[PDB]
Amino acid sequence: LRFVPVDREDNTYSYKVRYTLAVGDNRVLDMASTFFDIRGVLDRGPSFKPYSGTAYNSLAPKGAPNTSQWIVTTNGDNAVTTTTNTFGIASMKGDNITKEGLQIGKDEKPIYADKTYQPEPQVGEESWTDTDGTNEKFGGRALKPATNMKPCYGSFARPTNIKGGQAKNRKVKPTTEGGVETEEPDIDMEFFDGRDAVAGALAPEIVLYTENVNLETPDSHVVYKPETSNNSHANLGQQAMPNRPNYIGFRDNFVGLMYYNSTGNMGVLAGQASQLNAVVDLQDRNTELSYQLLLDSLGDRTRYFSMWNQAVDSYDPDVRIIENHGIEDELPNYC
Amino acid sequence: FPLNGIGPGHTYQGIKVKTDDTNGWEKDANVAPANEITIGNNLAMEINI
Amino acid sequence: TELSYQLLLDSLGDRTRYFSMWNQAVDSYDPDVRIIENHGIEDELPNYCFPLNGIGPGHTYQGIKVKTDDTNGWEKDANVAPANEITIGNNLAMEINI
Amino acid sequence: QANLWRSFLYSNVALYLPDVYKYTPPNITLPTNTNTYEYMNGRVVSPSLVDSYINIGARWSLDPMDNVNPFNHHRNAGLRYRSMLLGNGRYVPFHIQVPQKFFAVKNLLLLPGSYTYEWNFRKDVNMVLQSSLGNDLRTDGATISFTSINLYATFFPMAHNTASTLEAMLRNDTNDQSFNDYLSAANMLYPIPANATNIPISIPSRNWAAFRGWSFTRLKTKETPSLGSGFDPYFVYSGSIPYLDGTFYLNHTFKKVSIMFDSSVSWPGNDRLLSPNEFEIKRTVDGEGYNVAQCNMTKDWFLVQMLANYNIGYQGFYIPEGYKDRMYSFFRNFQPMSRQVVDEVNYTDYKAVTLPYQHNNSGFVGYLAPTMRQGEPYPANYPYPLIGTTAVKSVTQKKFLCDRTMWRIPFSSNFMSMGALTDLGQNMLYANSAHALDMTFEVDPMDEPTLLYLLFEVFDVVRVHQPHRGVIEAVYLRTPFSA
Amino acid sequence: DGTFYLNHTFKKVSIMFDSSVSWPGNDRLLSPNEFEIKRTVDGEGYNVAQCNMTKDWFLVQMLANYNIGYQGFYIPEGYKDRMYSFFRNFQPMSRQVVDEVNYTDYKAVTLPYQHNNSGFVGYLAPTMRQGEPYPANYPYPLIGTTAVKSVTQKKFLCDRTMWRIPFSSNFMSMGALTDLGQNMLYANSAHALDMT
Amino acid sequence: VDSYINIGARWSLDPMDNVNPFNHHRNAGLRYRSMLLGNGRYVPFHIQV
């Protein structure tokens, strides 16, 4: 049988609840069979991290950056921002490139890469016997210099379309006829050629789809970064480390959720015929410790009961005292 | 994988479309003459842990 | 009958021990496979693989000693080998997350 | 194998070192609050502090680790289980069932009638929530809000006739239910100032009847909150509270315990110990012959602890049976340890190389940071070979660890728990005379404020009477140290 | 062989005697006429163990197996908690998932369009690496300063065990011959039993 | 089912929930009974039932 509170009070750090425990006639009640049901909301906070490592690009080398661009200002006699200094990889292979990007198939009519999602960063050549030297055509994606340089390890950018494209929208499209601006993705196409490419032998070989994303590192921090500024060649080699784990949850046996051994916050159990309170409590007593030792005594303390949050605290015995047995490494290992 | 993620690359120069009568490709000059980009997949070695 | 024996022999004894006579080896599953504990991955420290000789490929170098003549320059030293292979910087390495 | 071992050692020891052993990496600005998660996530510990060769071939816990709380770890199975019970997300609506823990009303058989039931609940995140890092959750944006709290109660559908007979028989004066608190000790907290090693305490003259003994352990004021305050504004710690959950980890820091009665007589005296007037818990540097278990604990202290816990010691020493060796017991957690270290004085070729000047695994590890490899392959200068044909002169170190347990000094003539009411508890001199008790402790100094937890074993009983319908009367009695 | 693994698939159990009366009736449960094993989507307040099981079902299972529930809930001693018992295999679980409706910036990216560890893993197959190092679009961060709106899911698993509904007045195994087994109405009268 | 599946959560996969968990090679009893006969495809056996 459930009892709805007859009075409730909220304070700054206390929640006062009052009930009317009515035991019916020809009945008994064991107080050990009674409990409080608490339903509420919890915001654990930004310090919560119930795991080790990173969830994004875990296999990446901790110094490996994405395909990203930086600006080389280098103003000499005049302000000549060189710019478009690029560093990365292009992994998709197409048949040809004319002006519209990477051709990805045919239908006569050649189909071209959709700038919103193509080229997919998750695809590439299928076998190691690529044997590619015959003037191939390759395409990829890159990060515009307007996005902050970050290691690949831990990098996340939210999707902005059903196809997985993470590009933002560039609101700066003011129509010249006094009309409202129009949203569209900030995806641009840059073309590259080889080293000699003197006068006429200028045919593109890599087409990169530069873009801007909502880059963020939600479970890792940078542990090495040379210059406080951003978007420099030196910043390609910043190293990243995962955030420390922090498991946040309710205490064992809900110790602390109820008030004990406080004279100003003392619980009340009284029959209404009188008003005298049968609960007298002192500040020299420890109720929580008494329950802990009791429930140690009456049962085994490695088993877990989810009802009372009955999960003892412990530590790894190999971490408190260190067994340095050495390392069994007689056999060499190779890659 | 290599320390920098991708393996050794190649030198590349930026080029933009020609706005003149001939629609070819001329050297673009807001682009660096030496951009190191790798084509294909990166370098890797295999191990059975 | 089979279920009756199974529950009986559960009741009368412990069911993790194995007896080869009656093929008495209960079926079970890995508790970490039925319910997945995704604790993450303790991978703070980088791991590297290095060339067999420790350092990577090097470069050829010749010994030179200071000049005891009037001009204090550098002449070829000749107790030194013309081709000493020494690597500058750090060695070669590849990264792996074990 | 080397990489797996190094990863284990780093992620489980090096990141948990005290902040004196860490530095702030350059180009990085960290909050001034040392209790913030950002500060702890932004400091860098040199991996070479705890490396693959640390105490090679030895069973030894690190000395800096010895005074650090071991339950503030992500290897805590209970804590990580309780974290996963709520879910993996930062935002969670919860639904929990909380028990009643008061010793007087957690097992009472309530009779028919109408009663008023009332209690208070905390909203402080630093009290209701636990974190493995111990950072201040108040300043890190944790919030808890209660929507509705209900009380559930189940009844045995007993036959009405037998039930009526039960209330009829249970409303008499001789059928009053009686309960006692399991700990049954009066709790006293005493401050230990920083770097202080001597803490003397004084209790004025009072009756000492029904004394079942002492129990004492060390705590940390940063971890232990102020008792009785509805809200403690100086609590900046969200980790384990040993004062409340029993996870004690500083028992080894004691040196000796001295008991004086009436400021003149000594307890127990009567030359019952090798050191008759005090209790030498551990005796380092010395070693004339009064140590046991291949550690630094003294024979008398081991005998006293064994007799107090398992009644063992007068007829030989042996491993107690498991059903007495509970988790919070002594023999379960007693861990002797020993190791060898180089001889500074007698080794003629000794040099004191500092941390930035030690190279081992050089060229394949980072330099003072968990960063990329750098260096040359070169022979190591660290550590000193303690084995082999060229082993160095050595000196042995001994110590012991004893966690989640309380030191106990029982108030009996033979230190054995023959009964709850000790023999000296009903002794004539302690029956009617009044004595003032003086104690003096000796502890290993530490650079943080500490609190000496003292339990005066008493009898804490309550007699609850329900003579008519809807009437409860409870009569309390604490003996001694009465309310 | 007794290796049962689909006990959680039940929703509710209804018992009808003579097509008119309900067992056990007598308003002995919060849901008097049926046995609500689990109650998802709902949650007015009749769930326990931080999972989706109802209070009444937990009480019934505990009383049937270990005679526990009338005088508090506690872990049964091991020599009753055999391998094929209830408390041994009861596993409450809970998790958070992204809020589709309320998260304003939600996109439903399909499997072939999700890239994580891209450039270091294969594409939809346990094959060679292929791709570019690029920031991931999967999954949604449920922690951190930029955590997304979430909705909680609850369920439970209970293997190698049988749900039990005993034929006793107080659901307790006082003896092999149950009290209602020797009851007059079930002694000589004939009844047709309906279950749903 | 990748390394980030329900990161930091205690959760069994929903498709896995209706699949028989004892049909696994982590079955200790089954693999023990398989090894009792031997490692070969052909085996003469001798059992007591």
From TrEMBL, chain C:
Induction details: Expressed in the late phase of the viral replicative cycle.
Subcellular location: Host nucleus; Virion
Domain of life: Viruses
Protein family according to the UniProt entry: Belongs to the adenoviridae hexon protein family.
Quaternary context: Homotrimer. Interacts with the capsid vertex protein; this interaction binds the peripentonal hexons to the neighboring penton base. Interacts with the hexon-linking protein; this interaction tethers the hexons surrounding the penton to those situated in the central plate of the facet. Interacts with the hexon-interlacing protein; this interaction lashes the hexons together. Interacts with host dyneins DYNC1LI1 and DYNC1I2; this interaction might be involved in intracellular microtubule-dependent transport of incoming viral capsid.
Primary role: Major capsid protein that self-associates to form 240 hexon trimers, each in the shape of a hexagon, building most of the pseudo T=25 capsid. Assembled into trimeric units with the help of the chaperone shutoff protein. Transported by pre-protein VI to the nucleus where it associates with other structural proteins to form an empty capsid. Might be involved, through its interaction with host dyneins, in the intracellular microtubule-dependent transport of incoming viral capsid to the nucleus.
Note, other: All late proteins expressed from the major late promoter are produced by alternative splicing and alternative polyadenylation of the same gene giving rise to non-overlapping ORFs. A leader sequence is present in the N-terminus of all these mRNAs and is recognized by the viral shutoff protein to provide expression although conventional translation via ribosome scanning from the cap has been shut off in the host cell.
Protein name: Hexon protein
Organism from which the protein derives: Human adenovirus B serotype 3
Automatic annotation (TrEMBL), chain E:
Subunit-structure text: Homotrimer. Interacts with the capsid vertex protein; this interaction binds the peripentonal hexons to the neighboring penton base. Interacts with the hexon-linking protein; this interaction tethers the hexons surrounding the penton to those situated in the central plate of the facet. Interacts with the hexon-interlacing protein; this interaction lashes the hexons together. Interacts with host dyneins DYNC1LI1 and DYNC1I2; this interaction might be involved in intracellular microtubule-dependent transport of incoming viral capsid.
Further comment found in the protein's record: All late proteins expressed from the major late promoter are produced by alternative splicing and alternative polyadenylation of the same gene giving rise to non-overlapping ORFs. A leader sequence is present in the N-terminus of all these mRNAs and is recognized by the viral shutoff protein to provide expression although conventional translation via ribosome scanning from the cap has been shut off in the host cell.
Name of the molecule in the record: Hexon protein
Domain Adenovirus Pll hexon C-terminal: 1-150
Induction section of the entry: Expressed in the late phase of the viral replicative cycle.
Function recorded in the entry: Major capsid protein that self-associates to form 240 hexon trimers, each in the shape of a hexagon, building most of the pseudo T=25 capsid. Assembled into trimeric units with the help of the chaperone shutoff protein. Transported by pre-protein VI to the nucleus where it associates with other structural proteins to form an empty capsid. Might be involved, through its interaction with host dyneins, in the intracellular microtubule-dependent transport of incoming viral capsid to the nucleus.
Marked site: Involved in interaction with pre-protein VI: G69
Localisation: Host nucleus; Virion
